């Protein structure tokens, strides 16, 4: 029954961890306010997918979010994902 309450984990997306994604995309010079907006952009994309994964799960009467609920939730938004079983 150990439900260790979680809090303020969005700060695990550090500053270098965002500079690396910006580099992979082709960005040369990064400003100083992008770091607080990329987290806000990510925490919104994540909800719209985890909500649908949990919905697909509740309908099958289970308790384990599986690796196909996520693939279906993504395919439902026009973001098909190859490689994890389809």
């Amino acid at each position: 029954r150990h439900r260790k309450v979680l809090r303020d984990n969005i700060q695990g997306i550090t500053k270098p961890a965002i500079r690396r994604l910006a580099r992979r995309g082709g960005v040369k010079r990064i400003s100083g306010l992008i770091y607080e907006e990329t987290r806000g952009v990510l925490k919104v994309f994540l909800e719209n997918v985890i909500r649908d994964a949990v919905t697909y799960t509740e309908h099958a009467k289970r308790k384990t979010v599986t690796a196909m609920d996520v693939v279906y939730a993504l395919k439902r938004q026009g973001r098909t994902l190859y490689g994890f079983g389809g």
Binding site: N9, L21, R23, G25, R29, K43
Partner: protein, 98 residues
């Protein structure tokens, strides 16, 4: 006098380094603790598989890497080389999300 590389090169030569490897660029445990927490608002006491947390990391990375590709075109549109916070909102608003 430790040879002091000039600004604009240590970034320009790691651009061309991160565009040849295909690893994952975010930390595993710090990312996993976040997915498990966003999913407390929808149902208490959930359980994630091992391959369900790796299916979201790749989607998130492939979303951000292709948001920054479009940011880096608005910034060049305005005749700049840096990308401010007002470039991301234009990209999203033209795609159709905001």
């Amino acid at each position: 006098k430790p040879h002091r590389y000039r600004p604009g090169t240590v970034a320009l030569r790691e651009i061309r380094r991160y565009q040849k490897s295909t690893e994952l660029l975010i930390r595993k445990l710090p990312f996993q603790r976040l997915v498990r927490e966003i999913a407390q608002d929808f149902k208490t006491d959930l359980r994630f598989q091992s391959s369900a947390v790796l299916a979201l990391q790749e989607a998130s990375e492939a979303y951000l890497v292709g948001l920054f590709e479009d940011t880096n075109l608005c910034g060049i549109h305005a005749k700049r080389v840096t990308i401010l916070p007002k470039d991301i909102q234009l990209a999203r608003r033209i795609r159709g999300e905001r």
